[PDB]
Amino acid sequence: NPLTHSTPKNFGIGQAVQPKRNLSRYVKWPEYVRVQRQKKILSIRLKVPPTIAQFQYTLDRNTAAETFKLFNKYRPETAAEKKERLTKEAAAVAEGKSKQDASPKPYAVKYGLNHVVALIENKKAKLVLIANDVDPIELVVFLPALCKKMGVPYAIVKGKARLGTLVNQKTSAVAALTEVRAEDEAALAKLVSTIDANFADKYDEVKKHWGGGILGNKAQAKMDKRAKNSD
Template sequence: MQNPLIEKRPRNFGIGQDIQPKRNLSRMVRWPAYVRLQRQRKILHMRLKVPPALSQFQHVLDRNQATQTFKLLNKYRPETKAEKKERLTKEATAIAEGKKREDVSKKPYTVKYGLNHVVALIEAKKANLVLIANDVDPIELVVFIPALCRKMGVPYAVVKGKARLGTVVHKKTAAIVALTEVKAEDKSELSKLVSAVKEGYIEKHENARRQWGGGIMGAKANARTEKKRKALESAIKI
């Protein structure tokens, strides 16, 4: 029961009067063009029917396997300019002294990158593991890679983020990377990783690559469809 001594004082939200309550104004924000574009693109990908060749890029390697994969990839990052200069200087000095280049420093095993280079390695069956980014734009650049890998018997996986692949090879982004050779101590780790990718990714998403994607409607469209369905059911009952 309200205390009769307490007077009711209604607030006045006119200009210069009481402070208005805080509201969520995010829907009123004028977002930058790139934010609007990426949101609209995402909505379109959900609404429209997506062919299987494109839909398969939505199925990415799970977090645990991706962590293990990048842990191995980071061991074989390409040389920086300073490291390469130092290695070539040592080789040049050795050759000048009459020694063999191989005795001083061997060319290190590294992750291979660059679309044309990796495609050539896949066609030559030299790639042991291929990783493709799921957000390559335009997607036509890499849309044929999964089919090529299956044709050549090369294990592959789609991973989240071209920027994350780019960090491995000292670039802003990388559409695709491949591992060809590793050191003797890492061969068992690579074989385990390849078998895990074959069982946990390629076989798991075998059916998904044949299925169409998209066709996911929003809340309003679903509500309209449900309303029509209920109206039809009630009309049939009558």
């Protein structure tokens, strides 16, 4: 209107002083940031053997949520719960009913790495969950082939932090249950079928295939050009 006046700016070369912009691309980041990003990328390079290419097949979110829902039923105890049980079973059985028969048998996930490992060794395990994102990874590389040879159902999953939360811990790296009540065995089998199909049965094939090989945006598009524009 007739007091405001529309005066654009060129923002062009040799004139029209340049504005501010999103320079997140051209950042000179800190060292640790560059390190984690470049480690990720380098790991993406350098063709990965099948023994690690097992990983990065984690799950569908739907099956993930279903499984987690199952596992939440078989939580461990907490401070107050262990406190209560130990007050009561003691108070009764110590001068009363049988030692530790004065309180119910428990059910839970039976977490803990070496515990899990021994259970699998003893075939006493029923289902296994393996966080994909461990560091170091030799902790866990040997579990899938192990469970395969032992005929046990496993899956690789996401969020070792989620595993931790499942135990009221920061992280677990593992979670693998046996004790299941009769009510949940149907869902147990339901998940087992699809999961062995997805992970366990495909083991021997994935064990054949490598990973990596990727280029990255620039050289990748460049190879696409050197192939398409030239062939």
